[PDB]
Amino acid sequence: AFTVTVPKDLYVVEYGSNMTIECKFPVEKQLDLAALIVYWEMEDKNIIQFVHGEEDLKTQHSSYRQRARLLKDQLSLGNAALQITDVKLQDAGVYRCMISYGGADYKRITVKVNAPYAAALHHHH
Amino acid sequence: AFTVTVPKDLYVVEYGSNMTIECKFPVEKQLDLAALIVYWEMEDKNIIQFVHGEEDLKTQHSSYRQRARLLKDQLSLGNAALQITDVKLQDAGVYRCMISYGGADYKRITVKVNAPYAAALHHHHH
Numbered sequence A: 001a002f003t004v005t006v007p008k009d010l011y012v013v014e015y016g017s018n019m020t021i022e023c024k025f026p027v028e029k030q031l032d033l034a035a036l037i038v039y040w041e042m043e044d045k046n047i048i049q050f051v052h053g054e055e056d057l058k059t060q061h062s063s064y065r066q067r068a069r070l071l072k073d074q075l076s077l078g079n080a081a082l083q084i085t086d087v088k089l090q091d092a093g094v095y096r097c098m099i100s101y102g103g104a105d106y107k108r109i110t111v112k113v114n115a116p117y118a119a120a121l122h123h124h125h
Numbered sequence B: 001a002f003t004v005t006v007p008k009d010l011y012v013v014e015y016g017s018n019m020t021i022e023c024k025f026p027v028e029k030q031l032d033l034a035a036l037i038v039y040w041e042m043e044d045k046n047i048i049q050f051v052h053g054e055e056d057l058k059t060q061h062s063s064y065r066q067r068a069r070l071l072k073d074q075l076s077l078g079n080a081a082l083q084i085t086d087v088k089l090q091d092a093g094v095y096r097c098m099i100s101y102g103g104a105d106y107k108r109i110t111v112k113v114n115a116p117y118a119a120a121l122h123h124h125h126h
């Protein structure tokens, strides 16, 4: 059946770095943007919506303002990679990659963030 | 755009009663089953998969065995209504209705279960 696959279900990233979370889906012949829907969310916070060939962020949660983008170029290859710049402790948690493309599926990915003491302390208070 | 809507985002149900949680989506003319995907889950446990015109429960979690049903008649009206019979305290939580039909969207629905002391006790020490 139509299945979304994630090569890695767990990422361990360092505070302050960039991360790309990979998410795959079958592309039969040439990609039909009008039928492609991608949601990226993390525990109910919308990160990215991709509808009609364009990024929509009118409902993007505020913690990801200016830091999230979907790599448009790889969609035609079946790669819905989400790139998060300068990762923060608040970015740790469970992400969901939800794809609709003649069929619909989603997968979960856990992100862990390591951070030095100073950053962790600032986040603690 | 194609949008899923819920008439009620919160249900309060009594232990041991039946529950039907509604989930709406636009149907232009007549519903085309070959294009329809309906997916009902509750905090990561699959309740119902309805893929291009037929129910799949080969991935249905055990907690919903024999108790969950998708009302085929209301799908044809654009309502993906989920009925859970004899609701238990474990059924409380966040449900997600995910629909793909020339477009895709989902909504969350919260269920609270009021229970008498005895059922709550049995659940507390199981």
Ligand SMILES: COC(=O)c1[nH]cc(-c2ccccc2F)c1N
Pocket: A037, A038, A039, A098, A099, A100, A104, A105, A106, B037, B038, B039, B049, B098, B099, B100, B104, B105, B106
């Ligand atoms: C098995 O049915 C499913 O898994 C499913 N149904 C609908 C979706 C969906 C919902 C909003 C955006 C994108 C989507 F793909 C989905 N993942």
